[PDB]
């Protein structure tokens, strides 16, 4: 087994052992979808208050 | 009560296991996709092992070993025997085999050319000499040495294969069913047409001449070996079979064992063997979803409940344990 890149310090040791070798959306778009859902909420509430007005 | 589900209705074996479980009065069956089961008699393809063992308050058991397909596929078995040092390339009970992709072609051709200096009959899975024919027939298959000198029963000069049923429980105990069957060829064996060369039940449909259903069981075959060859089934054949079953399952135990798993597995295996004219046993294939013989369905399936199911879910020997 190969043991490579052994680094030692006073806190401990680091190394690597090898056995076998190989064989975003914009802020503009985020706010737009946050307000498209708020629009849908206010619509659904408006339909409720319209129904209660009847 | 215990609860179980059935996800393979085409399973002749576990159809009988379901009836026996229900008749106990301590097992009730749920719907296919009800998660609150104790036992799963699952499907054969893409069984969801990743969903087992996550129901609180339920000990879950399944009738299949995840990863056992590497022993029950013709291509997987050959790769396993060659690459596993427990079995090795020098394995004395497996015929020479090579995996061909329509590969090992160049390495295979070297053996077939070394077979030209001398018999060179092979089978692909069909049967042919020389071997150039079968390659164009293949165009995944596996080519294997055809056993040209098999043991032939008399009267009839017949070919046969030996099927042994093996159950491995949640503890990885290996249970060999004391009852096996010889699937006979009711056609005389011709060394120079595949009805005599292939011993499959469906291929035989001279059928039924010497015994009912072309199925000779162990009692008659033992008496034949005594009268004809002055030996017994135990000494001449069954010792090698138990060695091959033991060796094959001990090899893959680290890969399939459910000893410390959140769910448990058992599985019924069907081992098929070939016997040559010198009473040497050869393993040909392993089946992960085998069907039993009608004469033995009642006894074997009852032994599955006793040994594999009731051992985990107890209520209010027909096997030979292979020791390791």
């Amino acid at each position: 087994m190969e043991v490579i890149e052994l680094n030692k310090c006073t806190s401990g040791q680091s190394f690597e052992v090898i056995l076998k070798p190989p064989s975003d959306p914009s802020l503009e778009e985020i706010q737009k979808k946050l307000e498209a859902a708020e629009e849908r909420r206010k619509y659904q509430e408006a339909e409720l208050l319209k129904h209660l007005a009847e | 009560m215990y609860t179980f589900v059935v996800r393979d209705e085409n399973s002749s074996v576990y159809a009988e296991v379901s009836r026996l479980l229900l008749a106990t009065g301590q097992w009730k069956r749920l719907r296919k996709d009800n998660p609150r089961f104790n036992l799963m008699l699952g499907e054969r393809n893409r069984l969801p092992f990743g969903r087992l063992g996550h129901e609180p308050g339920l000990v879950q058991l399944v009738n299949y070993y995840r990863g056992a397909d590497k022993l029950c596929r013709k291509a997987s078995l050959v790769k396993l025997i060659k690459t596993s040092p427990e079995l090795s390339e020098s394995c004395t009970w497996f015929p020479e085999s090579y995996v061909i992709y329509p590969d090992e072609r160049e390495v295979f051709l070297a053996a077939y050319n070394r077979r030209r200096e001398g018999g060179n009959v092979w089978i692909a899975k069909l049967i042919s000499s020389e071997a150039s024919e079968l390659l164009d027939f293949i165009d995944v298959h596996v080519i294997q040495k055809y056993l040209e000198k098999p043991l032939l029963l008399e009267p009839g000069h017949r070919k046969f294969d030996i099927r042994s049923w093996v159950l491995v429980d949640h503890l990885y105990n290996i249970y060999l069913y004391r009852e096996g069957v010889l699937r006979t060829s009711s056609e005389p064996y011709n060394s120079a047409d595949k009805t005599c060369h292939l011993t499959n039940h469906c291929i035989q449909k001279n059928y039924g001449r010497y015994e009912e259903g072309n199925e000779m069981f162990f009692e008659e075959f033992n008496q034949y070996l005594m009268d004809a060859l002055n030996t017994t089934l135990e000494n001449s054949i069954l010792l090698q079979i138990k060695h091959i079953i033991r060796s094959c399952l001990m090899c893959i135990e680290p890969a399939i064992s459910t000893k410390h798993l959140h769910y448990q597995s058992f599985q019924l295996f069907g081992f098929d063997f070939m016997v040559d004219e010198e009473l040497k046993v050869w393993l040909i294939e392993v089946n992960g979803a085998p069907a039993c013989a009608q004469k033995l369905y009642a006894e074997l399936c009852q032994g599955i409940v006793d040994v594999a199911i009731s051992s985990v879910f107890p209520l209010a020997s027909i096997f030979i344990k292979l020791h390791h």
């Binding site: 087994m1 076998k20 190989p22 | 969801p48 990743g50 996550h54």
Partner: protein, 437 residues
């Protein structure tokens, strides 16, 4: 030195953050009032622990942390707890009403009201950083705040800090300890929205740590305090390299380099050993070989799965205690001959090992006993996809009947986001199987 900011969202994120920061102070020798007599550079410095702590003129060591919850009763216990002096009031943010186990209520309705405040408080910590690497985000999959608001936060952190890494410590839902029936919905929704914004996510199935507490700690009914003290031990093992001198996993980018070759497959499996009960009078201390062998038992993993029926892409061994490289290599040699450890053909078969000589630190009066050596294994195995199969199947059962969907649509969410999130999960499952078969 480069700083890391921790963000704790929802109940699970806050209480686990409590456990971690309690453990950090004990390891680094920081007192509940923020004082650290070990520190000789008063008022600042670029030591390794300053990655997680800032320093004031009075000598206080302040966590680079922000706690967010849409409902105040959980963070209020932090405001009056043992470490109340540790945190500044501005880095503890609470709302009035929570998300009610509703992803859409935490992401859209209530999340919009508080997101700009949190990012401002987050910006106040980043302005005290000379070289910010990124963020560690602690949250739950099932919570309405842990799922809904975190995904909204992860979206905005990618916008405001594009060149920074973002790691997750996510609590996978387990019905044994959860009180919400719609956690598969919240989990799939938040995994879909966060996937492209998270560079590395360490999942912790509550079922796994629950049974570990039952089996190995002799605790009949483990509480969140039992669970979180064990979780923080694993988290500390993972973050020890960022807080201590060493050469392995020194920055957040090295986590993705060493563990995540495929961006979408960024869910390493964590296995930890030994977990020993403090009430066990007689205990035989386990060797390097025994604890390294335990890293391959599913009973010790943070997610119950079978790594034998998958393939590895990377594997780190993080040792704490009396461990030397000679014994690690001997243990690895014997383990390879006896276990099914299959790497993908485009990866080298090997382990990156990090050893910290200081043994694991335990909370006084806790359930964990002091061990002479422990190890946490980080292994990116395709076997962890079993948890996605479990989660997606439960999602499929409920969504086929549109059960509870009206709660999410009633918060402005469209029914299309469900199937959009589920198709992404379907793509993730096939990516795993393509690599692992």
């Amino acid at each position: 030195m480069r700083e890391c900011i921790s963000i704790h969202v929802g109940q699970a994120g806050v209480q686990i953050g409590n456990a971690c920061w309690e453990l950090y102070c004990l390891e680094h020798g920081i007192q509940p009032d923020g004082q650290m007599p070990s520190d000789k550079t008063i008022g600042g410095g670029d030591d390794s622990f300053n990655t997680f702590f800032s320093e004031t003129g009075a000598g206080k060591h302040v966590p680079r942390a922000v706690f967010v919850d849409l409902e105040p009763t959980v963070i209020d216990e932090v405001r009056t707890g043992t470490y109340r002096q540790l945190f500044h009031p501005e880095q503890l943010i609470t709302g009035k009403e929570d998300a009610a186990n509703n992803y859409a209520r935490g992401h859209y309705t209530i999340g919009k009201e508080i997101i700009d405040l949190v990012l401002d408080r987050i910006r106040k910590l980043a302005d005290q950083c000379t070289g910010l690497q990124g963020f560690l985000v602690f949250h739950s999959f099932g919570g309405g705040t842990g799922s809904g608001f975190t995904s909204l936060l992860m979206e905005r952190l990618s916008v405001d800090y594009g060149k920074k890494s973002k790691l997750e410590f996510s609590i996978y839902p387990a019905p044994q300890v959860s009180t919400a029936v719609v956690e598969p919905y919240n989990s799939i929704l938040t995994t879909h929205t966060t996937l492209e914004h998270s560079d590395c996510a360490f999942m912790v199935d509550n079922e796994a740590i629950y049974d570990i507490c039952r089996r190995n700690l002799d605790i009949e009914r483990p509480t969140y305090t039992n669970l979180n003290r064990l979780i923080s031990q694993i988290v500390s093992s993972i973050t020890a390299s960022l807080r201590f001198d060493g050469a392995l996993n020194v920055d957040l980018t090295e986590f993705q380099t060493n563990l995540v070759p495929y961006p979408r497959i960024h869910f390493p499996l964590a296995t930890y050993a030994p977990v020993i009960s403090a009430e066990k009078a007689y205990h035989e201390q386990l060797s390097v070989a025994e604890i390294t062998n335990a890293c391959f038992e599913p009973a010790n993993q943070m997610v119950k799965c079978d790594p034998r029926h998958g393939k590895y892409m990377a594997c780190c061994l993080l040792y704490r205690g009396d461990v030397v490289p000679k014994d690690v290599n001997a243990a690895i040699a014997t383990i390879k001959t006896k276990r099914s450890i299959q790497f993908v053909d485009w990866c080298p078969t090997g382990f990156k090992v990090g050893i910290n000589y200081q043994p694991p630190t335990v909370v006084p009066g806790g359930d964990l006993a002091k061990v002479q050596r422990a190890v946490c294994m980080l292994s990116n195995t395709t076997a962890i996809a079993e948890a996605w199969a479990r989660l997606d199947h439960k999602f499929d059962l409920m969504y086929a009947k549109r059960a509870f969907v009206h709660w999410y649509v009633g918060e402005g969410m469209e029914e299309g986001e469900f199937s959009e999130a589920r198709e992404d999960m379907a793509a993730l499952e096939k990516d795993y199987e393509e690599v692992g078969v």
